[PDB]
Amino acid sequence: ASVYAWNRKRISNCVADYSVLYNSASFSTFKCYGVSPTKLNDLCFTNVYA
Amino acid sequence: SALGKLQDVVNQNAQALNTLVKQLSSNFGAISSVLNDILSRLDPPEAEV
Amino acid sequence: DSFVIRGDEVRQIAPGQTGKIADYNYKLPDDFTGCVIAWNSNNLDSKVG
After folding, report:
1. CA A45 – CA A12 distance, rounded (Å)
2. How far is residue B31's CA from residue B40's CA, in Å, rounded to a whole number?
3. Cα distance between residue A39 and residue A45, in whole Å
4. For A43, which of B31, B40, B43 is closest by C-beta distance?
5. How far is C18 from chain B, CA to nearest CA, in Å?
6. C-alpha distance from C9 to closest chain B C-alpha (Å)
């Protein structure tokens, strides 16, 4: 979607492998703010939104 | 209220201990007041801060 | 320490960076002192084929 109508998808009830996001070189910017990128496989979350 | 002088000292010491324990719940501007949450969420360059 | 990398990977030659050549090719410590030097070498380290 466009940025004025940005699409929000709920992520819930899943096990997430973020290591395929870290190890992929396709992303020009992969920058996390309140959490380390390599600790994402060790934590549990709710209210995940893309 | 006959024994208020001793009870005042006991209450002051217990209140000072309770305040010192309560001060651990404050984050003092950090992201969390729990050290384990910071050590499990962040890399050491920003977890150091 | 001399090497040749890409143009977008020059941000990863730094302390406290997350990145690819930082993890598996060349890592700088968090207490690193010194200078990193980078200049474009498209005229020397590139071929048309």
Report:
1. 9
2. 12
3. 12
4. B40
5. 9
6. 20
